[PDB]
Every structure is written in structure tokens, then in C-alpha cells.
């Protein structure tokens, strides 16, 4: 009952407006070599969604690091937008660096399947984490009433990246898994004759030939990780309403 | 490919699992439950086992929020209880919730779980439907990375916590930098209601569109903050070792 | 391309949501025995609209007396209507007392036609001029580097009601005709009989079979539409930009 | 509802019978670098409709002055077209210079969304303003029972040629507005940069980023508009059937 | 009903994941100038399809020496496979030497007609007997609760090849036709010139123009087939559970 | 290209002609408790298909011994069928006791999916093995050039009926599977629980919780079935083309 | 209804299957100068069939006279065909020399029209009869209750070829017709010049201009086709059953 | 590629127009118990037509004598059909008592499929025999140059109504079969009894089971059908031409 891009895919083209020109998606980002999180909020002017966007602003230079761009969405006008911006820097002291997709007409969140029976007329709390090829690598799906944990997005690009180069799939709750820590997985063997070389071989870790990790990742990379969810866990020395 | 949304009824359907047949969403609504709906590709595959085993090790405060698990993937009954063997026999922990098996991906195809990544298997998808049957909150992971279980803990926590107080949950929740463990009072929606708002002075405004309060309880707030310390820290004593 | 609502149709049943409340179109302007004005403009926080907007306000008492309510619309949200209609308060010290449509998906849009070539997101500047009995009488349709004439409406309304009331037909330019003035026009003959007896009859004027008219409107209904152009014609004695 | 041509798209391209000849739309005006307007009426030998060609008539001079051909449109002959221009200029005194299409099928009115719900067989009082481009600016639907204001007409082509010419949008009212008079509006920064820019540099008047305003309007430009409103707003000095 | 392949078409072309790679049939076994036998059975970890694979595994050198590949099917995954292939090693001391094809979303079970009404997601235990130029010849279709006879599939396989290599048919039970023993059937007379050839000849034995045989099979051929027999009726010395 | 009847499915409901007279399937088999064979042959007067016509009814006693009627099937005339029947009874010595459907045009055929790429115009070797219930339980295809194994059929009733009796299901070759001999396979588990009972009820012998039997069929139940193969197994005594 | 060839059309292209072998109809007679008559019967080993193949055989020299060559067909098999020619020599003593078609799933029937209401399975006793060209010149439907009059298809033939030599039109009961008795009909006039022309010429016998006549058919030619009626006439003088 | 009624049908229900009234059939036949031969010919005023009305005259009363009435048809009008039996009365001294169809727009000759590829215009010589029921019987397709044998339709009716009374089929060339002269065919025996019963009884002359006749015609009926075959090959005493 509601049509979406799928994990795999190419994001789809289209063009876009922002409060920062015209753009197009996918190709904008990945002419930079950037991966990009897209995200919706239901409309300006709203409290979670200002949380979100102040949530993003502060972990913008981690997302710089990664290589990665941010942009919002929701169905209001360009103006709205900086008005919202601008609203935020007023009340908050947080100024926000990234765009948003003005989609008046719900043209972007009927393409990318954003409208939910919550709301006709507002756009759910999507996110779409796509790689510097273009390609969708993971969908979240929040509703109205809750806020996302942004750091969870974080360390998604993170161990993908670490995934996508060492060759290695990524344990639940990496780097802190219960089983094997912060090791990463080898891809499961899909033959005999690869089981065997894998149980012969005694290069890796391995419960039985399916289940085979080593610790590849760089003590950087690991601590990197760790950080993202420490600062998810920690209550803030500071409540930003408190100075304003 | 076409999904469920959030705000619709959980699709009606029998399926089979390890435990038996059951209705969803009926069988979770008549024990007055939520239900955690979870995907993973193939049974014997290491990213799969890795979060079988976090949901295990989480299986009591899944119970203390009120909310069942119910895992699915594409193979049979069979495979099912000889993989939740394996578990058990190498690794230690018994897996205590059932497994879905749906070999020609009729549940898959109707939950949209069959991504661009594989056309056999399954995504890492997730469904938080609550006790009336209605989904709450969708997730996607991919076959490279396991899912972050202490969130869908959090989430199932901060949206019973809104229910039950008529409040949103900001961004982070209960670690907010604006509003700390505050939660949101819904915006005013009329300038009748606009101007109630900010001559009232009941909460903290930023503004008549941001108001805020601290109506958790303590034990409300520790349990969620618990979920994300749990998350970041790291194991005392990792299970390939004590197995 | 592109279909409309038409004269002498019923407006088109809908429920819409305003930033005063939801309510049923035209039902709830039907039920009260009210005219209603619909109009549209492209964004809230653009100049011309804020023009527009304020131009309707300092009208609002003229249209209340004729029986006629307002009603805006938009493709935005309520939140940007309230926060809008606060900075006229604030910027130019001018309450607008009417709602405004919040039409994010422009479901609305399309169902009236108000989206043309110039955008494909924003309203052009539509006008919806409905009688009590829930009938369109008039539609007007602005662009968006152009203000409407807020007088006309007034005139248009005041005219129609006259003419409804008398029976008569409203001639060019009225209440100043330059062929006769303040006078109404009796609808033209149909059959070879009526027009032989209205040139028998000493009841009308006539130029001839086919021109009749007579003088019913009162004194203070021909005053009341000069007004309306008088204050179209003449500068403003003091302009409020001035007056902050 | 009814399809039409839409603000912003060219004028539909076609051949159309007039009393003056054979003329394909809307290229016969761009060709002479002239703007038109194209406006409708019921029937021939009716009496509103008589005064609004009256009307035109007695303006022709000023829309010849703004570049301005007229062109009306019924669904009579040719044959009754030339008997009604001979019956006014008979029993009014005033000769109507200008073309008339005859649409005796309807093809014209169908192809323009000019039958509306008050009659199946005759014209609504439609109002097509198009720029010497060939390109549709503002559309009016006036019905039987009610005459246009023509000197609304003049405005919106002055208020358009304007804002074309001195890159500006056109407040509500206008050259009367009450806010800012006379003055003329800079289309609002659709950027965060843009609206910074705006609001750093003195280069306007503004009530803030998204309202800035000048007055590069010449008093000649100012005064001509303003006069076409004093001329709707005056008691005739002497009515034309009186000089009969 | 439910849709099939038929015996005299050619093996539909797809490409399928076993437990040993990627494949395309029937060109994979073409190629190699191989015979295969393609058999579904419901799902692995189950006690008569063990059976069953067991019982091939038992007769795979009977099969190599025909010049006879053996491939199987379940839409259980490629990691079930290799499990299910080590559990049987383990507990019954049988290495299963042949692939099993993984088709966990019924695609290939679809193509092949294989989902019969006993279950809506496990195959029945089809049997596809493909020749060297990758034609269906021959196709069995036993149910969830009854094991196929093995050597039923060598005596076809090798009573094909014989029709094929010598010109000549099948009887019934052969090698042991009640009728004709280890005889070979030549086709039939199709025109009246043929049968009155065949009664004038004196080349075969004939009980009539429409049955003649003789017997040109070597004894090592008929040999070969009644051992299949045999090895079916003879209850085993020693049962592989003990041994285990 | 071809669609047929299913394992599981209830034999579709049919009026047939047979050279013993009109009867309904299932229903006339069904009334009587009966199961029945429907086997199919390309054409009367063929030898391969002579063949299987005397393996059938020299196995007559066989199949009444296990409550099993025969039909057979051709696109021949009941004239034909007649024909041949006197052919065989009088060249070999042999009486055919059971009806032969006539289908000249295919129409049971088409229904029962017999017509194959290998004839246009004449069906395969099909066996339907049905059961008291009119369920349809095997479905064999053997080709033109093939003749049936006839004992197999035997065996796959009685096993059938056996599994039914007992609530079993029959291991591979039975009853002579290498793994278990006579033993009779219990349905595996399918839960946890079941899995847990079985491994600690010490009432079956097992291999694993998925892998369970006993030997609950009688000495004579094991010992005709072993007849059936050994019989298929044994060089005949005397040939009848002998003893014509 | 059902659907046919029709007079004047070629014969459907087609490879037929005969007791002789496969041929292409029309080609096979047209590339050797020969009519043929195509006839069908319901079923071999009937009756009246078995009496008009009888006729047919003793008509065999006659035909070949003609240069007409004779094709049966029924949905029997070619092997049926041959035992029913068997058993015809061996019953009655007549040998068929000309072939049957073998139709066993109505392919050729139904192509012809060949299966009417009397019988769903079996064809009607239909009869084309096919000029060198490869044209039908006449077609006949017997049904299953009544055989043919041989000599009426030898007269059809021989009048027939008498019409395309002579270019003359046959009367009715040619060549005893009682009007002009073995004379030929001349085609009528279609002009009112050639009607004027035939009237005037004397070089025909005439009742009037649309019916004129003569004698060009030969003493042989006549005296053949009154033999065909004489034979038809005649009480045989022995019966072949009281010789067997 | 062409329609008809077939064998075994009821006549297709029609009214039509004849040069005797407006008629049903088959009802006005049916209604009376009489049979109907219903006949075409391609235009009046065509001479093989009219030697076909004169002989169908001449067999008036051995028509009529067998229950049988006789109706033409062509599309020629009710006027020339009048016309040309008045034509035939005076140059031929033969009056036709019998009515024709008027078809003149082809609606009842495409209804019975008589419009073939000789003539896009004219019907072919096309015969429906129909009983007494309104059963389609016997159906024959002569071209436009070829006369009709009239005495085989006599002798088909003939045939027909003894075959009904004496349930016998009829030989070829009855009565006089090469065979069986004017003997009748027991339908055969359809199953294995009754083939064994027929065998037994020593009821009947048989060749075999299949073909058995007797004598039960009447001296009358056989010496009935002789006269139509013997006047069929008789030369005719006198010619009408010479004694017109």
C-alpha cells in the first residue's frame, strides 16, 4: 500500500529546489565524490523536527569527515525554509550549513514513498543513506511523534565504509558485539568446496565454516565508532535552552 | 517495490513458523503485546547469528516494554530449528522467540522485504507494531551490516512514553542538547490555540511552536539511557570466547 | 490543458483545513447565508501576497456589510500561515482576521486548476467569487508578478447582488456608464412578441428592441459602489511602511 | 469543469475568422511586436455587451498608446458581427474600429474553456491578456449578468509592461497601495545566500529579507495608471444616450 | 491445474545457483556430451528426501558410467544445502558427491511446474530425464509421502540410450518383457508399402505387420539393466543405520 | 508449453467414452471405493503400447487384490479399441479385461495435459494413479519409445496405501531402502517442541530429531511389495511370443 | 454455425499424413496435372464407410480416366487405416488402392469444416472436389446415417471438365436434361449490346436472349457420363457379399 | 474462411419474403410435418437456373409424395421472381408451383453461408435438406456452371426417411449397392458386449462385428427409389425446346 525505492538501487534522478539553488539527485553528490544522508521532516516550524535539524548541525564536521553531505526535505516553500533557518539561529544560537528540498507539490515524496497514513499531507521521517555511486544503502522509516538518534546514522556510514573497503560484513551492535567485538565478518563460503578451503585453511576466527571474522579494522576506525554511540549514551553537560 | 506505512493496520496473514501457525498481527494483539517483526536473509550466515543473539541477550527487556519478537527469512521450519541448534551448540544462547519461514517469499513479496541487494533473500527489515496491530516504525539495513538492537529498544520505549503522556520525543531522546530528557508538547495547529499557548506560561517555549516539559519518570528516562550505555560500551567477556 | 470549476456551477464539495479549523466548502459558507471570496497566492512570506493579504484586511469591514466572508489558500502550512500572519502583525501592524487554506499536497490546487505554467508548485493569484447559494460567479486569475485590484472584488459582489435583487443586468464600468451611468439593464427580448411589446411599453429607456434599461438601484447602493472605486483611484494619505 | 490555456504557456496557435479577415492567432500580433486582448461575449444586439464594446471603444487611444490590439469574440456570424458595429455606431455615435472573431461551432470557445454553466450555447464574458511574445498573463471570467471594468484592463497591461521593463513584481492596489504606494517590489531571494546579500547591502527599502521595494517608476508611468482608475471612479459628465 | 515443460522440447533455458556454482541448463551438460537427471524434493533436513539422496548417492557411479550427471532441487538456501550434505556425512556416513540447485523464491520451481497441491511452497519430487542435446525424454512426479525407486531412473536412462544407438523401441518391463524377454521393438510400419515389406521380408519376428522385434542389445547392456532390477528387489544385507 | 491435473487435486470431473460404455471420473471409481490407474498409449495397434496391455492384465489379480481398477486411453475409436483387443486375444494368447477410453479429438487428452512435443497427434505414455477419494496421488510421463515398468505402479499403491493406514511416509527403494529396509519414516517435527519431545521419548529410532522410524508394517504387507520388484527383477520362464 | 473453404478458392495449404505417406494438398495433385476428390467418413471399421471405399475402388479406372486421383480422411490412425484395408481385401475382396488421411486430433477437420452436429468427434461424409489448379469447384456434405452416390461425384467431374473445355455452362440433369437434352448453355449476355447481338447472330439455338444452347460435347463424352447414370440405375447382377 | 449452418442443427429461425408471402422457417414447415429442401441459384433469367426450376417442377409430386415442399432463393426481388416464372410458363409451357426467396441485400444468404468466391454478388447452388423437425440433414454446394442432379435429391429424402422409420444406415448407391443391393445397415455394436452379442444372436447378415445389414425396406420403397435413378439416366424421349 505505498511504492518506494529499494536497498541496491540507484537513487532516483530527479531535480530538486533548495534553499541553497536547484540541484540533481544523485548526480550533485556524487560528481563530489560524496556519499549523501537525504532526510524528511513533516513541515517547518515543528519541535522535533527542529531537535533533528540541530542534532544534524552539530554533528555536521563528523559527517564531513566521512565524506558525507546532508540534506532535509519536507513539502514547505523555500522561504518557509529560511525563515525556519533563520528561527533556529534566533532562539537556538545553532545555525544550520545543509539544504532543504522545497517539494510543495509532494512531487519528491510520492517518488520516494515519504507519504504514510499518519499524515495526507506531511512527509514521514525518511531517511535514505546513499553511497559516491548513487546507490541506496539502507532506508529508515520514523514517525511523527518520535525523533531519529542521529548518531545511529553515523556509525551506519561508518561501518559500511570499513565494510566496503576491508572486504568484511559488520556484526550487530559493531563495534561492541557481543560475540566477536569489534571484529568484522567474512562473507559466508556458497560452495563445498569453498567450506572446505575455509575449515582447511586456518587463516580466520570461526565457529564452523559459516561463521569465520578477523580484526581488521584500524584502532582509529574502532575508537571513531565508539564516540558516535558514547556521545548517543551520555546526558549533555549543556542544555543549549538553558543559554540560548 | 510496494511496503506497509507507518499508521496503517499490520496486513493481515497466517504464517508459519518454528512455534506453530499463527495470525499476525491477531496472535500479538489478543496477548495485549507489541510485536518486533525482524527479516535476515538465510539461516547458517555469521551477520544474521550476530543479531539472532543481541535480540536474545535482550529478550527480558523486549518483555519488560510489553513486546514479543518474531524473526523471518525465506527458509524452511527445518533449517529454522537446526540453525537455532547450531546457536545454541557453538555459541551458547538458545534463541526463545520464533522464526517465520516463508520458502517462496509470499510474506517477503507483501512486506516489500525483497530488496535490489538479492533477489532471494530477504533485506535486514524491521517492523515495530504496537498492541492495537498498527505499525509504529520501519527500518531497512542491508546484508553487509547488523542492525543496532539497543535502538528498537529505545524506540519501543520513547513511543509507549508518548502515547501514555500526549508528548512527541525530541531528536535523541533522553540525551537531547536543546531539552535534555524534556519531552514535546504537540504544536498549536490554529492562532486560537497559538495565542493559548503562549499566554498560558504551563511550559518551557522557545517560541508558540516549541514547548516542552519533564513529565518521565526517573525510571523512565534511566531505562532508555541504559539501552544506549549498553550500546556504546564494550563487552566484559566476549561469547566466542565462553562458549 | 488543465480543467476548472466553471460559472454557474456549484463550487466543488471539499473538506479543507485552515489555520482557524477545518471546515466543509461551501457548506459552511451556505449555512450561514454568507458570499464567499476564495483566493490564492503563490507563498506565504512573499511581498506581493503580504500587499494582497493587507490589501483584503483594511476591506474586511466593507465585505462583512455586503455579507461576504474571506478565505485564502496556499500550497503552505498551517505553521507558516500563523507564523506569517504574525510577522504582518509585527512588520506592518496590520491583524488579518480571515483564515487561510494550508493545501501542502495541493490536492486543493488541482482540484480548483489554480496551478499554471509561470510555477509548478506555487498557486497562481485565483479569485472564487461564490454567492450564498454556493454558485461561482466570477473567477479572475493573476500572476504572480501582479497584486489584484481588492476594489473590483467589492464592485463585482455589490453588483451582482443589485442585479440579483432588481433583476437586472449590470452594464460595463457601472456605477459609471458612459452611455447611462448609474442605470441597469433589463434583460433583451427572446421572441418576436416580447420585443414588439417592449417597444410598445413605455416602462423603459430604450435605444432600441434589444437596449433597455431604468434607474432602481437606491442612492446609498450607487454610493457605496462609487466608494469602492474612489478609494481605488486615490493615494493613500499616509502609507504604513512610514509608520514603523 | 472545463480544460483552458494556462498563465504562462503561449497563446494556442490558430486560424480565426474576424470582420476584418482571416488572422492566425496569436502570431498576427507577435509579428508586430503587439500585445492583445482577446475577450469574449454572448450574443450580438445585447445590451451589456454593447456597452462594453462602447467601452473599449472610448479607450482605444490608451491601449493603442501601451501597444495594446483588441480583439473580441462571439459565436455570431461575420454578417451579424458587421449589422451590430452598424447599430451601435447608428444609435450611440461610436464607431468600434477593432476585429471580431465569429465562432458560429463553438470550435474557438471549446478550444479557449469559454462555455461555462449559465448557457450551453453562448460565451462567458472571458478576458485573455497576451504580451507581444505570444505568451497568456492574466485570464478573466466574467459572467452574463455583470459588465467588465475595462479600465482594470489598462492597469494590468501598464502594471505588467512595467514590471517586464524594470525587472519588478507589482503590489496589490497599485499605484495606490497602501503600504508602499507608488512603489514597486524586487522579487524575494529564493537562498540563504541571496537573502543575506539582500539584507546586508542598503541598496532598498525592506521590512525584512523577503519584502524589499524601490520607486523606479516614472511619475509619467505613476500618473497614467493612477488616471485609468480616476476615469472608472468619475460620474460621467455627459451619458452617450443623452447625444442620441 | 499448473503449467509444464513436455517431453520432445528442449530443457528451458535458466540460470541456476547450486551448492558447487553457477549453472546454465541445460547447456552446462550439453556441452559435456552429459545426460542429466534433474529431481526436486520438498526441503532439506527432511527423512524420506535423505533417503532419496542417499539412494542416488549409492547408484552416482551407475549413473557416471552411463554418461549421467545428477543435479536436485529445493528452494531451501545454498548454506541448508551444504548443512544438510555435512549432517548426512555425519550421521549416515554417505558423502553426497552431486549439486542440489537453491531456489528459495520458487523461480525455477515456477518454471518447471513443480509446486502440485500437497504444498504451496515445497516442490513434489519431480524427475526431469534430460538427454546429451538437452531434451526432456521422460518425467515422474511422486508425492511429499512416497519415495521415488532409483533404479527405475537407471533402467530409463539406459533403455533410451539403447532406442536411441540401435533404431528401436522399449517393450514394457523390458529387460524382462513377458512377451519378448531382452527383444527391442522396431517401429511400426506407417504406409501399406512398409507393411507389406515388412510381412515379405523375413528380417524380424512378427506376430504381424505392426509388431516385430529382434534382439540386439549386447548381454553386457541387458546385463547391466537387470542388475538395476536386482539390486531394487533385494532386501540390503546390512542397513547403513547400524553401520552408523 | 503444457498445463495438467496436480499431485494433491481431485481428478477432474469428466464424461468419458470407453469401449465398455459412458462413464464419469472420478466419480464411477469413487462410488465404488475404488482407486484406479488411467494410463494413456499413442495408438492402438502398436507393439510398445501391446506390450504394457499385457503386462497390465497379466497383473489384473495384483491390482484387484489392492482394490485398483485400470483404464486406459488412445485418440482411437472404441471400433479401434475393439479391433485390437480381438488382435491381441488372438495373436498373443492374452485377454484385456479393462475399458480404453476413445478420444479422437483430444479432448480428454488436452484436459489431462498427454499431448507432448514428441506427437502432435498422439498422447504420451501417462500414468494417473487415483485414489477412493478421487484424489489424483502420482503422475508419471513416459515417451513414445519407452515402454512402462508395470510392477512400479504395484508398489506405488500399496506404499500409498500402507503411509495411509499406518500415518507414515516410505523411504526411497522401499522395501528395500538401504538406510532403514522395511522401516516406515515418522513425519518430521515441525517446532522446537515437537523437536524436543521426539529426541527425549526414546519411542522411535531416529538419527537426528528430523529423521525418526519403526517397522509397523506386517510380514506380508513387506513381502508382497518385495514380490512386485522381484517379479520386475526376474528373465521370464517362457516368452509368449513362443507359446503365440 | 461452422466455417468451410468455399467454391472458387484454392484448398487450403497443409502436410497431410496418408497410409501412402505425407504430402502438401493442393501441390501434391497440381504439380501432376491431377484433380482430386478429397472425401472424409466418420470412423474406419463402420459400415457404410466400408461401402462407399468399395465404390470408390470400383470407380478407381474411371477416375483415372478423367485424370482424377481419390484421398479419404478420418481422425483415425494410419495404422487403423491399414487394418481396416486389410480387412476390407480379406472380408469382401476388393483392395483400396487410393490413400486415407490420418486426422487423430481433428487438425485437417476443422480446417475443412468436417465436424458438424450429428457427432463431436467423428467427421460428416463431406466431399471437395479440386480442379489442377488446386481450385474447389463443388463440395458436398453427406451425413453418418446415408452414403454417397459415387456416380453423381464421376458425373459432377466429367461436366465440370466438359464446362472448362468447351466454355459452356451444364444444365440440370446433364446429359439428360429434358429441356435441351445433352446440350451445353452458352453464359448469358450481360450488356444490352451482347443482349442484341445474341438475339441477331442466329448462330444458337435460343428461347430468348439469356437462354441460348448447343451440341458440342463429342458422342464419347456424352455417352461416358450417361454410363455413370446407367450403372447408378442398374440392380446389380451379383452381390459381393454372397462371394466370400 | 466461410460460415454455415451445420449437419444436426435446427435450421437457423428467419422470416423471409417469397413470391407466395412472408413465411418462418423452419416453423411454416414444421407446423405442417413437412420436410423442406430449400435450393439457391445465382440470378432469374439465368439458364442452367432455369433448367433447374423445370426439373425440380417435373419432380413436383415425387416430392410431394415424400412429405417434402420445395422453396428457391436468390437476391433477386419478389417482382423479377414473378416475372421470370411467368417467362418459363410461356417459351417453356412449365409452371413452377413452388415459392422463391426474395434475398435482395444477401442478409438470408449470409445467414447460410451462400455467398462463395465465384461471386461477390450471387448465391451458389446450394441445397439444405431439412426434416420434419427443422434438423439441417444433408447440405450440397454446386458452382454457378454446373446443373444440379435433381433425382439424388429425391433419392437422399427417400433414404433418409427409411433409415428414421427402420433405424438402418444406408449403403453406398442404395438401392443398388455393390454389396449388399438394397439392403439397410445395422447401426454397429459401440462396446465389447454388445460386439459379442451381435457375434452370437445369428440375427442378422454380418462380414464381421462391425457390419451387418438385413432387407426390411418394402418392395414399394426400394422399386420408389429405383424410378428417381432410372429417369436419371434415361435419354429423354422428346425435348420441351422442340414441342415449346
Do not use: C
Not at 532543504?100 to 520516494?112: H, K, N
Not at 553515523?154 to 560475540?179: F, H, Q, T, Y
Request: hydrophobic share 40%.
Amino acid at each position: 500500500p505505498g511504492s518506494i525505492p529499494l536497498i541496491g538501487e540507484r537513487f532516483p534522478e530527479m531535480e530538486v529546489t533548495t534553499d541553497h539553488g536547484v540541484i540533481k539527485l544523485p548526480d550533485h553528490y556524487v560528481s563530489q565524490g560524496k556519499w549523501f544522508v537525504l532526510f524528511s521532516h513533516p513541515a517547518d516550524f515543528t519541535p522535533v523536527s527542529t531537535t533533528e535539524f540541530v542534532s544534524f548541525a552539530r554533528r555536521y564536521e563528523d559527517f564531513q569527515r566521512l565524506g558525507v553531505d546532508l540534506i532535509g526535505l519536507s513539502v514547505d516553500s523555500v522561504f518557509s525554509h529560511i525563515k525556519w533557518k533563520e528561527a533556529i539561529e534566533r532562539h537556538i544560537g545553532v545555525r544550520i550549513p545543509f539544504p532543504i528540498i522545497a517539494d510543495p507539490q509532494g512531487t519528491v515524496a510520492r517518488r520516494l514513498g515519504l507519504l504514510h497514513a499518519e499524515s495526507a499531507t506531511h512527509t514521514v521521517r525518511g531517511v535514505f543513506i546513499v553511497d559516491a555511486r548513487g546507490v541506496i544503502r539502507t532506508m529508515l522509516y520514523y514517525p511523527m511523534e518520535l525523533g531519529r538518534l542521529v548518531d545511529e546514522i553515523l556509525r551506519i556510514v561508518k561501518a559500511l565504509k570499513l565494510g566496503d573497503s576491508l572486504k568484511r560484513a559488520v556484526p550487530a551492535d559493531w563495534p561492541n558485539n557481543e560475540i566477536i567485538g569489534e571484529g568484522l565478518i567474512v562473507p559466508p563460503p556458497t560452495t563445498e568446496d569453498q567450506a572446505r578451503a575455509r575449515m582447511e585453511s586456518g587463516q580466520y576466527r570461526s565457529l564452523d565454516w559459516w561463521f569465520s571474522w578477523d580484526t581488521p579494522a584500524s584502532r582509529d576506525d574502532v575508537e571513531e565508532a565508539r564516540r558516535y554511540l558514547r556521545r548517543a549514551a551520555e546526558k549533555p553537560a549543556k542544555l543549549l535552552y538553558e543559554e540560548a
